[PDB]
């Protein structure tokens, strides 16, 4: 009868449906979750053959592929990719759209699609504030809790790439608004 703080704040709970507390999915939201969408190369058979520079380029490519695609459903305000170790968060991709209608259009389309040879899972998410949701250790220092951590470990792309994507979307949005 007490709200599950972790489900509502982080959009994910280590207990799943076994949680003693309340998880209710919203029927409308600005935010979606694609659980376990991001597969970090490090944890794959090939993964240790890659240099740090190769890994950074691979992640920028992933982040770009995500942001560009989600933009087609509507204005993207923020995109977060979780690099947590714990099952409830590992590889979670969260997207906050400007409009709730964008989020609904997104999950309906995404749930019929594939990504890198796996079918895509997408749902509306209760998360409203990525600042609250993100692990402040993983930001400031290193978080050393591993799977024990209940907060998002946001993996960030090159700052120049993010600025460029934001600009590209602004242009796209302006060109669309100029159609009337």
């Amino acid at each position: 009868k007490v709200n599950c703080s972790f489900y509502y704040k982080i959009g994910a709970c280590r207990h799943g449906e076994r949680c003693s507390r309340k998880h209710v999915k919203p029927n409308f939201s600005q935010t979606i979750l694609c659980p376990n969408m991001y597969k970090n190369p490090i944890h794959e058979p090939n993964g240790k053959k890659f240099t740090q520079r190769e890994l950074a380029e691979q992640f920028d490519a992933f982040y770009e592929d995500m942001f560009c695609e989600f933009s087609k459903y509507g204005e993207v305000e923020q995109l977060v990719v979780c690099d947590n170790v714990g099952d409830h968060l590992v590889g979670n991709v969260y997207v906050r759209f400007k409009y709730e209608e964008s989020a609904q259009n997104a999950i309906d389309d995404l749930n019929s699609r594939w990504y890198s040879q796996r079918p895509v899972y997408a749902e509306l998410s209760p998360v409203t504030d990525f600042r609250e949701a993100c692990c402040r250790q993983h930001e400031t220092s290193e978080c050393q809790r591993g799977g024990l951590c209940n907060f998002m470990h946001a993996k960030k792309p090159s700052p120049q790439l993010l600025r460029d994507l934001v600009l590209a979307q602004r242009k796209y949005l302006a060109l669309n608004a100029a159609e009337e």
Partner: peptide, 20 residues
């Protein structure tokens, strides 16, 4: 933004959508 490429025309380094 006259110098800016719109995001729907952004060349992606490695796109993996709809790969089965």
């Amino acid at each position: 933004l006259r110098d800016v490429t719109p995001i729907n025309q952004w060349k992606r380094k490695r796109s993996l959508w709809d790969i089965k």
